[PDB]
């Protein structure tokens, strides 16, 4: 059982990570549209926050695999 | 806007910057008297063609980091 809720946990992480990629791409587009100056940096900064999320998710993901034997 | 031109003596390559629209006279003398040598002592080449006076770099399709040889006589 524990093995399983772990497994379904991982897949949740994977899909979380993917939608975060999309988001980033999407806002990296909103920025390659380059849009006087404020929102550009603002958007760009949210992006930074999202990469954090990414590095942290990988973090969970990894230690999470200590429990599949 | 404004490009960068490497001018090679043979050993040393004193390296310059000009508006794309500037007659290459200016660069020629800039180099010349950075060398102390006087102008008609020198021959400036590009694609093996003697560069003449009024020719702007815009003419010759130059770019960032192109090389201009400088010979004597």
């Amino acid at each position: 059982d524990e093995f399983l809720k772990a497994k379904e946990k991982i897949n949740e992480i994977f899909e979380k990570l993917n939608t975060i990629r999309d988001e980033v791409i999407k806002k990296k587009n909103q920025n390659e549209y380059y849009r006087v100056s404020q929102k550009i940096k603002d958007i760009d900064d949210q992006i930074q926050q999202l990469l954090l999320k990414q590095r942290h998710l990988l973090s969970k993901m990894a230690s999470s695999m200590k429990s599949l034997k | 806007t404004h490009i960068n031109l490497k001018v090679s003596d043979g050993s040393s390559e004193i390296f310059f910057k000009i508006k794309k629209t500037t007659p290459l006279r200016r660069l020629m003398e800039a180099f010349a008297k950075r060398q102390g040598k006087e102008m008609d002592s020198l021959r400036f080449l590009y694609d093996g063609i003697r560069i003449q006076a009024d020719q702007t770099p815009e003419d010759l399709d130059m770019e960032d980091n192109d090389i201009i040889e400088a010979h004597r006589e």
Binding site: - | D47, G48, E63, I67, E69
Partner: protein, 155 residues
Amino acid sequence: SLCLQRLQEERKKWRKDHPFGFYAKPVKKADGSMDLQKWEAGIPGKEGTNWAGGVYPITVEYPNEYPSKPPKVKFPAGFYHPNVYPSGTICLSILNEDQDWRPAITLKQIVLGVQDLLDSPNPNSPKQEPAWRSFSRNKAEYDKKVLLQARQYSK
């Protein structure tokens, strides 16, 4: 089209890095348009050799499958050197499909390779018969004809 894009970048790399004294550009055809498959080049002679002061023309004709097959290189009509053909052709080892040609060979590598053979004629593989007779018969006057062809080519 890739052959052509190759040459186009090749040209601008040349313009950014090429040995001092040498030159290379493609030719205009009867249109006024650029023939990126045909090139004019000049190879200066190494100072202190009888080839010094000489700046010698070669043309480079690139095939349609460049860089799969390498280009043919031609000195003028009847150039005087033991390894130039009477047709003006030269065949360097790196310039050889059947030998050592590869698509990574720089134009700069080619001009340099030629000018090295100018005062390093490999006598094991003569390609002309006046030039080679005199190179083994008497360099005395061979050197003389070398100097006239040397001086010849400073336009």
